[PDB]
Amino acid sequence: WESLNTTLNRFTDNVVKFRRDSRTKALKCWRPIVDGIVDYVKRKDDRFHALSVFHKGSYYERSKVGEPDEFDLMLVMDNLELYEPPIGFTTVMIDQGEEKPWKRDECVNRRGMLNATRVKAVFKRLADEAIQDMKSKGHWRNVTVKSGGTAVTLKISKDGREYSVDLTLGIKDNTWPEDAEEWKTRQRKGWPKRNLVHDIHEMGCHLVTKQPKGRGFLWCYSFSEAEKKLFLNSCRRQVLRILKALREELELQPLKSYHLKTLLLYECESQPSARQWSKDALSERFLDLLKRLEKCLRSKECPHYFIKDLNLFEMLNPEKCDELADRVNKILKQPGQVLIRLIK
């Protein structure tokens, strides 16, 4: 007999460690490629002269065994920083002084409204041009842009591994969106600290070239910077990594990493104290998160953490959600045995 805490720590030390090592090995491959694409595009096109990589706290998702690992990266147009659409989305009017380069390929309209779809298509052509420049120079033989789709996706192969790197374009917006204003006023019990809530609200968000799942002028709210600040002794990050590895090991698609992060943030508001996230509390927080996940799957309701009226499960197949909920209950019933099966 060993405690569930001990088994969870063995899972961290073996399975989560392998996940981390796999992420690191991939990053060493694709980071110079993305840096090279950004460098070429900002040198070659005046619309992208201020493009930069935004370093996110969480950006790695493994797929089913046999499928490429996935990375989601945001590239920010720093010069465009800002000082009826569906929930989660907005239009973007850019500063008139920044308009003129975007008249090329009609990326901006007569009102200053920047078209996310056209911006993305232009960037995709330029990213392809950057890759072809390296191939002409004798490099990057196993790098391509994925044809079609609504996304700019790099396919990279190295030493047997396959990687799929999504590149989204972003604009910093110093205004906290109305869709998320309830996040500021939400009744809490000490977590996050009120001053941290205030600071995040004042910092704002990013607007990114993602389209709604349920028009080309729409941009998507991204709270990546706020999320990083909230996770910046404590087993909060450890139990999130355990859940992410479990999602992948047990192939719980269409559940996503971001769903698990969302549930952890809500659990941190419900359990605000440091003692509730001590080392000794690991197993009970793990179980609490699985119970929250099962409840969200059975109701097909997973509210976004900042925009509570956006349901992250709205487009999932409800029968598949029921099947996933049944699997989660099996983990809850025999978690030590599940973990032991995966540790081997």
What domains does the chain contain, in order, with CATH numbers? 4-343 (1.10.1410.40)
Q: Which residues are known binding-site members for Mg(2+)?
A: 70, 72
The answer to whether the CB of 25 falls within 8 A of the CB of 162 is no
Binding region: 70, 72
Technique used to solve these coordinates: X-ray
Burial code (b: 16+ CB inside 10 Å, e: under 16) for 147-177 equals eeeebbbbebeeeeeebbbbbbbbbbbeebb
The whole-angstrom separation of Cα 162 and Cα 65 is 11
Alpha helix (H) ranges present in 98-215? 116-136, 182-185, 194-203
Would you give the DSSP letter of residue 245? H
What element of type H or E holds 170? Answer: strand 161-173
DSSP output for 318-330: HHHHHHHHHHHHH
Nearest by Cα to 225 from 25, 21, 74, 12 = 74
Identity of the amino acid at 228: K
Resolution, given in Å to one decimal, reads 1.5
